Write a protein that binds this ligand. Sequence first.
Ligand SMILES: COc1cc2ncnc(Nc3cccc(O)c3)c2cc1OC
Length: 283
Amino acid sequence: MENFQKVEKIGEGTYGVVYKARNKLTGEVVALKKIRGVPSTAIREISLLKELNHPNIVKLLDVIHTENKLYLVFEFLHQDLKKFMDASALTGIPLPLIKSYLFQLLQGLAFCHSHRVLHRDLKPQNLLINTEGAIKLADFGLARAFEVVTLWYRAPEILLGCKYYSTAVDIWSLGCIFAEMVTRRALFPGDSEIDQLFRIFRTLGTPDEVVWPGVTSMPDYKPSFPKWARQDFSKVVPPLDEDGRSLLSQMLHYDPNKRISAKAALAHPFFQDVTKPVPHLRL
Ligand SMILES: COc1cc2ncnc(Nc3cccc(O)c3)c2cc1OC
C-alpha cells in the first residue's frame, strides 16, 4: 500500500474498494483492490487464481498480504461496459460489436468453467473493455475464495434458495446482459428478491415440474406463487434476429441442467459471421 500512489477511487465492489493506482517502482498504472487475520484458505484460493491466465480475463498481477491486510493488483483497463452502454444509449451498440463482446465473454467463461471456477456475480460493471475491441471479465473467482445491491442478473435457482449452484448461473447472467445490450433496457430490474423472482416469472412464465423438474422442492419455493404465462420472445427482445433469440432462450432456460453451456454456445449459428470491430471509446 506504500508502494502505490492511489490516483482515483474507481469504485466499491462486493469484496472491496478498487483504486486506479501507480506503482511507484515500475511506474505502471494498475487497478488496486483492497479486500474488505486473512483466512489461509482464501490466501491459497487467491494464489490459485493468479495462475489462471486468458485473453478475456482481467489479469491478476500481484497478491499483497502484509500487516494482516489483503490487496490485489489487477491489470488496468480503459472502461467498463456499463459506462460504455450509457454512452451508447441514444443509438445503441452496433450488433457486430454486441456479437463480438458476447463471443469473447463466452470464451472467457468456457475457460473459467473448464477449470471449475464460477463467477456468480456477473454484471455490466464487472465487464471491462479496451480500445482494441477486447472485453474481459473482472472478479472471477473471488466469490469462492472469500445496501442497494443489484439483483438483476441473478439466476432463478439462487433466488429460490438452492445452495449448490453450478456454472449455469453465469450463463443466465450473461443471457440477461446480452438482452440488455440489444434492447438498451435491463431485462429483469427487480428491487428485491421476491420482486426479482416475480419479474422473471411474469416474462418467462411461472415454472413448474414440467419445465423444471424439482422446482417445487426448492427451499424458497411457495405453492402460493402466482401462475403467470410465458411471453413471446419476439416481444421481449424485438430487434434481435431469430438466431439471436434462439441462443438467448437457451441461455435463459429455467432448468440449470438444460441451460446451454458456454462451450456449446460458442458453436451456435449466431456466431457464424462474428468479427472483431473496434469500439469508439471516449476516455
Ligand atoms: C477505466 O475504469 C476502470 C478500469 C479497470 N481496470 C481494471 N480492473 C477494474 N476493476 C476490477 C478488477 C478486479 C475486481 C473488481 O471487483 C473490479 C476496472 C474498473 C473500471 O471502472 C469501474
